[PDB]
């Protein structure tokens, strides 16, 4: 078959407080994307938002500058449940 996970995840543009992430969509018709962001090795609980399945980019705002964040995109499809098929990257804002 073909993979149900997003392929290439990178920070395309950035502000000291906000990030714009891009991914290459999986070949499967995606129902929704769930994005989780949190500080790498921080004490704070992870933040999560949802974006439509037609979208291949997302914006994370309210971030603290010069901090390492871990960003994960979860893609839901016919054969992928909500938090299956994850792609993660690390970025320093």
């Amino acid at each position: 078959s073909v993979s149900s996970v997003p392929t290439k995840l990178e920070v395309v543009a950035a502000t000291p407080t906000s990030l714009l992430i891009s991914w290459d969509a999986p070949a499967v018709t995606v129902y929704l994307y769930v994005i989780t962001y949190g500080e790498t090795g921080g004490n704070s609980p992870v933040q999560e938002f949802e974006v439509p399945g037609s979208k291949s980019t997302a914006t994370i705002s309210g971030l603290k500058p010069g901090v390492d964040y871990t960003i994960t995109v979860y893609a839901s499809s016919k054969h992928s449940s909500r938090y299956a098929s994850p792609i993660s990257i690390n970025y320093r804002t």
Binding site: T29, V30, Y31, L32, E50, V51, P52, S54, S76, R82
Partner: protein
């Protein structure tokens, strides 16, 4: 009353729909569908399905459907459905996917239709063959949220 805090989104994306209104021309437009499962504030034991139809272009175009487990039984008998309320959302999603994946030269062809006539609008997904428009799902939507 739906508890949006305890609600889970299963499906949030545009779907191609043929929209028919009494005094306007038929339009093939991509409408954003959001499907949510959750419980009511009045009772965590009552499970509810929510479907919201919206347009990114028009802020006055809103249609909503809420189906309770009791309501599903009437829907199950009238439409010959063979699955439980738990599997009901996934089947609706698969039918919506077939409308999205439909190609121009398809026979039979899957098509989604929203018919707006006054206070109600009826949403249907049909398979069009040589004989008839055979109904896969027919749902009654109310204007608003």
């Amino acid at each position: 009353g739906f508890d949006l805090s305890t609600a889970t989104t299963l499906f949030w994306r545009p779907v191609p729909v043929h929209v028919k209104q009494q005094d306007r021309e038929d339009v093939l437009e991509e409408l954003t569908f959001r499907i949510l499962t959750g419980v009511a504030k009045q009772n965590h034991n009552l499970r509810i399905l929510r479907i919201h139809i919206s347009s990114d272009s028009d802020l006055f175009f809103l249609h909503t459907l809420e189906v309770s487990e009791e309501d599903f039984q009437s829907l199950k008998n009238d439409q010959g459905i063979l699955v439980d309320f738990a599997s009901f959302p996934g089947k609706i999603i698969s039918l919506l996917e077939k409308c999205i994946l439909a190609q121009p030269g398809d026979s039979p062809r899957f098509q989604a239709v929203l018919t707006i006539r006054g206070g109600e609008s009826v949403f249907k997904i049909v398979e069009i063959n040589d004989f008839k428009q055979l109904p896969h799902i027919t749902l009654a939507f109310r204007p608003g949220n």
